[PDB]
């Protein structure tokens, strides 16, 4: 799997809420940046953050702007939404950079976006 397809196949899996299949194109010891926020070191401790930023969350539709790779590396321009519990949408506009690792798997996911557009819709 070349890594623009696997950070394609990544964001598919946070759409159809696959979870598993999310968490299986990434490494074991993934790094996950949210860039105001300290870094999330290791797939357990993304699987704990996950589940934390999700506990409100019915569904994501993340859509990608614009994908570019230069080898390992893949950069994205999105729209994160969201739909919460009580059927409220929201969206966040974010880049993300990913990095595969040897097996071609995300060993890092870095997003920089507004901190405050962040907190005006994850706020309750
Ligand atoms: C970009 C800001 C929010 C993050 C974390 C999930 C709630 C995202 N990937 O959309």
Not at 47 to 76: K, P, Y
Request: glycine share 6%; aromatic share 12%.
């Amino acid at each position: 799997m070349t890594p623009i397809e696997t950070v394609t196949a990544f964001i598919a899996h946070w759409n159809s809420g696959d979870m598993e299949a999310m968490y299986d194109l990434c490494a074991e010891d993934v790094v996950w940046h949210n860039i105001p926020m300290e870094p999330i070191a290791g797939k357990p401790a993304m699987r704990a953050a996950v589940e934390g930023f999700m506990a409100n969350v019915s569904q994501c539709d993340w859509q990608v702007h614009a994908i570019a790779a230069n080898g390992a590396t893949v950069l994205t321009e999105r729209t994160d939404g969201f739909t919460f519990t009580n059927g409220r949408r929201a969206t966040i506009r974010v880049m993300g950079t990913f990095e595969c690792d040897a097996e071609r798997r995300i060993i890092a996911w870095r997003d920089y976006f507004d901190m405050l557009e962040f907190q005006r819709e994850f706020a309750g």
